[PDB]
């Protein structure tokens, strides 16, 4: 279920946002993975239980969590799924997890692992998706050093480092917004249906056609009862995309 560092940071950020974190800090070096958490954190009694939620407690794993009504906080260290033992630590409320040579005890997993730069870009794109999805949550990313953005309303302008025009349309059940700058030497077309990101290449070529061919486009869509690779009732959505590209 893991297979990659980007799935490690996916699970740890996923639990972090499930914890009502408003601040998520991800550090990778390509080896450790670290995710530091603003959230409610784990009860001390459950700290050893949850390690045997995260597995990927193989490999070489260390966690510490303070629950928000507990004054103490607790750290467990395991290696390759076997516990190297626990201690109490003063920490702020939240969780830190450290990963630190994934797949050391299992080669032919570790040789499946891609190039340094490739996994770095996978982690960076995932943090981009979590950021564009969650404007009200801080995110930080470290590789050498940072990538950072705070609570915002248009966060599209911070992550893509450009100024966007905002477009809007609502018809029937469908409400969809767009953020578009014009140039940036490159097409980048992002589409979010509900808050879930969609990589569908048909929709990105459609966005290439109705918007500009080298353009930034970030499209947030809301339709209530749909399916999610995803299925919807396509014609009225796509003609609504044709609409608001006429501003």
Coordinates of C-alpha atoms in Angstrom, one line a residue:
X1 CA 0.0 0.0 0.0
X2 CA 3.1 2.2 0.3
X3 CA 5.8 1.3 -2.3
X4 CA 6.9 4.9 -2.5
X5 CA 7.8 7.9 -0.3
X6 CA 5.0 9.9 -1.7
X7 CA 2.5 7.4 -0.4
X8 CA 4.2 7.7 3.1
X9 CA 3.6 11.4 3.1
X10 CA 0.1 10.8 1.7
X11 CA -0.9 8.7 4.6
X12 CA 0.8 10.9 7.2
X13 CA -0.7 14.1 5.9
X14 CA -4.0 12.3 5.5
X15 CA -4.1 11.4 9.2
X16 CA -2.8 14.9 10.0
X17 CA -5.7 16.6 8.3
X18 CA -8.1 14.0 9.8
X19 CA -6.6 15.3 13.2
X20 CA -7.8 18.9 12.6
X21 CA -4.3 20.2 12.0
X22 CA -4.1 23.7 10.8
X23 CA -0.4 23.4 10.3
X24 CA 1.3 20.5 8.4
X25 CA 5.1 20.4 8.0
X26 CA 6.6 17.8 5.6
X27 CA 10.4 17.4 5.4
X28 CA 12.0 14.9 3.0
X29 CA 15.6 14.2 2.2
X30 CA 16.1 11.6 -0.5
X31 CA 16.8 9.3 3.5
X32 CA 14.1 10.5 5.9
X33 CA 10.5 11.5 5.7
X34 CA 9.1 13.7 8.5
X35 CA 5.5 14.9 8.9
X36 CA 4.9 17.3 11.9
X37 CA 1.4 17.9 12.9
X38 CA -0.8 20.7 14.4
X39 CA -3.7 18.3 15.3
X40 CA -5.2 16.7 18.3
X41 CA -2.6 14.0 18.5
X42 CA -2.8 10.5 20.1
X43 CA -3.6 9.5 23.6
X44 CA -0.6 8.0 25.3
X45 CA -2.3 4.6 25.8
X46 CA -2.9 4.3 22.0
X47 CA 0.6 5.3 20.9
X48 CA 1.8 1.7 20.8
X49 CA -1.5 0.5 19.5
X50 CA -1.6 2.6 16.4
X51 CA 1.9 1.5 15.3
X52 CA 0.7 -2.1 15.3
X53 CA -2.9 2.6 11.1
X54 CA 0.7 3.2 10.2
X55 CA 2.5 0.2 9.0
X56 CA 5.2 1.5 7.2
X57 CA 6.1 1.1 10.7
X58 CA 8.2 -0.9 8.5
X59 CA 10.7 0.6 7.9
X60 CA 12.9 2.1 10.7
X61 CA 10.1 4.2 12.2
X62 CA 9.8 6.8 14.9
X63 CA 6.7 8.5 16.2
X64 CA 5.9 11.0 19.0
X65 CA 2.5 12.4 19.8
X66 CA 1.0 14.6 22.6
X67 CA -2.7 14.5 23.0
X68 CA -4.1 18.0 23.5
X69 CA -5.5 17.6 27.0
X70 CA -2.4 15.5 28.0
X71 CA 0.5 17.5 29.4
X72 CA 3.1 14.9 28.5
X73 CA 3.3 13.3 25.1
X74 CA 4.9 10.0 24.2
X75 CA 7.5 8.7 21.6
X76 CA 7.7 5.1 20.3
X77 CA 10.6 3.9 18.2
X78 CA 10.4 0.7 16.1
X79 CA 12.7 -0.8 13.5
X80 CA 11.4 -3.1 10.7
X81 CA 8.2 -3.6 12.6
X82 CA 9.8 -4.6 15.9
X83 CA 9.6 -2.1 18.7
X84 CA 12.8 -0.6 20.0
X85 CA 10.9 0.9 22.9
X86 CA 9.2 4.1 24.1
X87 CA 9.9 7.2 26.3
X88 CA 8.0 10.3 27.4
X89 CA 9.0 13.6 25.8
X90 CA 7.9 17.2 26.3
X91 CA 6.5 18.3 22.9
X92 CA 3.8 20.7 21.6
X93 CA 0.4 19.2 20.8
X94 CA 0.5 17.2 17.7
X95 CA 2.4 14.3 16.1
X96 CA 5.8 14.0 14.5
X97 CA 6.6 10.9 12.5
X98 CA 10.0 10.0 11.0
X99 CA 10.7 7.4 8.4
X100 CA 14.4 7.4 7.8
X101 CA 15.6 4.8 5.3
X102 CA 12.4 3.3 3.9
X103 CA 12.8 -0.2 2.7
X104 CA 16.2 -0.8 4.4
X105 CA 15.3 -4.3 5.5
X106 CA 13.5 -5.1 2.3
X107 CA 15.5 -4.7 -0.9
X108 CA 13.7 -5.3 -4.3
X109 CA 11.3 -2.9 -2.7
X110 CA 14.2 -0.5 -2.3
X111 CA 15.4 -1.1 -5.8
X112 CA 11.9 -0.4 -7.1
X113 CA 12.3 3.1 -5.7
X114 CA 12.7 5.7 -8.4
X115 CA 15.4 8.4 -8.9
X116 CA 16.0 10.9 -6.2
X117 CA 14.5 13.8 -8.2
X118 CA 11.5 11.8 -9.4
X119 CA 10.3 11.0 -5.8
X120 CA 11.0 14.5 -4.8
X121 CA 8.7 15.8 -7.5
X122 CA 6.0 13.3 -6.6
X123 CA 6.1 14.6 -3.0
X124 CA 6.1 18.2 -4.2
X125 CA 3.1 17.6 -6.5
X126 CA 1.2 15.9 -3.7
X127 CA 1.8 18.8 -1.2
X128 CA 0.6 21.1 -4.0
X129 CA -2.6 19.1 -4.3
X130 CA -3.2 19.2 -0.5
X131 CA -2.5 22.9 -0.5
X132 CA -4.9 23.8 -3.4
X133 CA -7.5 21.6 -1.7
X134 CA -7.2 23.1 1.8
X135 CA -6.8 26.9 1.8
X136 CA -7.3 27.2 5.5
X137 CA -4.4 24.9 6.5
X138 CA -0.8 25.9 6.5
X139 CA 1.6 23.7 4.6
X140 CA 5.4 23.6 4.7
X141 CA 7.7 21.4 2.6
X142 CA 11.5 20.9 3.0
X143 CA 13.9 19.3 0.5
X144 CA 17.2 21.2 0.9
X145 CA 15.2 24.1 2.3
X146 CA 11.9 25.4 1.4
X147 CA 7.1 25.1 0.0
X148 CA 5.6 27.4 2.6
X149 CA 2.2 29.1 2.5
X150 CA -0.2 30.3 5.2
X151 CA -4.0 30.4 5.6
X152 CA -5.4 32.2 2.6
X153 CA -8.4 32.6 0.3
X154 CA -6.8 32.6 -3.1
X155 CA -3.9 30.2 -2.5
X156 CA -3.6 29.5 -6.2
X157 CA -1.5 32.7 -6.6
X158 CA 1.0 31.6 -3.9
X159 CA 1.6 28.1 -5.1
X160 CA 2.0 28.8 -8.8
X161 CA 3.9 32.1 -8.1
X162 CA 1.7 34.2 -10.5
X163 CA -1.3 36.5 -10.4
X164 CA -4.6 35.0 -11.6
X165 CA -7.9 36.2 -12.8
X166 CA -10.8 34.6 -11.1
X167 CA -13.8 33.3 -13.1
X168 CA -17.1 32.0 -11.8
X169 CA -20.2 30.2 -13.1
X170 CA -23.2 28.6 -11.4
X171 CA -26.0 26.9 -13.3
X172 CA -28.5 24.2 -11.9
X173 CA -26.6 22.1 -9.3
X174 CA -23.2 22.9 -10.8
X175 CA -21.0 25.6 -9.2
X176 CA -17.5 26.0 -10.5
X177 CA -14.7 28.6 -10.1
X178 CA -11.5 29.0 -12.1
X179 CA -8.2 30.8 -11.6
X180 CA -6.3 31.6 -14.8
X181 CA -3.0 33.5 -15.6
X182 CA -2.0 33.8 -19.1
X183 CA 1.6 33.0 -19.9
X184 CA 4.2 31.2 -17.8
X185 CA 5.9 29.5 -20.8
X186 CA 4.0 26.3 -20.0
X187 CA 0.5 24.9 -19.8
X188 CA -0.5 23.8 -16.4
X189 CA -4.1 22.7 -16.2
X190 CA -5.5 21.6 -12.8
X191 CA -9.1 20.5 -12.1
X192 CA -10.7 19.7 -8.8
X193 CA -14.1 18.0 -8.7
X194 CA -15.6 18.6 -5.3
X195 CA -12.3 19.0 -3.5
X196 CA -10.9 15.9 -5.0
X197 CA -8.2 16.4 -7.7
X198 CA -8.7 15.0 -11.2
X199 CA -5.9 14.1 -13.6
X200 CA -8.2 13.2 -16.5
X201 CA -6.4 14.1 -19.7
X202 CA -9.5 14.6 -21.7
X203 CA -10.6 17.4 -19.4
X204 CA -7.1 19.0 -19.6
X205 CA -7.2 19.0 -23.4
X206 CA -10.7 20.5 -23.3
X207 CA -9.3 23.1 -20.9
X208 CA -6.4 23.6 -23.5
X209 CA -9.0 24.3 -26.2
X210 CA -11.5 26.6 -24.4
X211 CA -8.8 28.5 -22.5
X212 CA -5.4 29.4 -23.9
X213 CA -3.0 26.8 -25.1
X214 CA -0.1 28.0 -22.9
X215 CA -2.1 28.9 -19.8
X216 CA -2.4 28.3 -16.1
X217 CA -5.9 27.0 -15.3
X218 CA -7.1 25.8 -11.8
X219 CA -10.8 24.8 -11.9
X220 CA -12.7 24.0 -8.7
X221 CA -16.0 22.3 -9.3
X222 CA -18.9 21.5 -7.0
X223 CA -21.6 19.0 -7.9
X224 CA -23.4 17.1 -5.1
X225 CA -24.1 13.5 -6.1
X226 CA -21.3 12.1 -8.2
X227 CA -19.2 9.2 -8.5
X228 CA -15.5 9.3 -8.1
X229 CA -11.1 8.5 -12.7
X230 CA -14.7 9.6 -12.2
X231 CA -18.2 9.7 -13.8
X232 CA -20.7 12.6 -13.9
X233 CA -23.4 14.0 -16.2
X234 CA -21.0 15.4 -18.6
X235 CA -22.8 17.7 -21.1
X236 CA -24.0 20.5 -18.8
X237 CA -20.7 20.5 -16.9
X238 CA -18.6 20.9 -20.1
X239 CA -20.8 23.5 -21.6
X240 CA -20.6 25.4 -18.3
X241 CA -16.8 25.2 -18.7
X242 CA -17.3 26.6 -22.2
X243 CA -19.4 29.4 -20.6
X244 CA -17.1 30.8 -17.9
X245 CA -14.1 30.7 -20.3
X246 CA -16.1 33.5 -21.9
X247 CA -15.5 35.3 -18.6

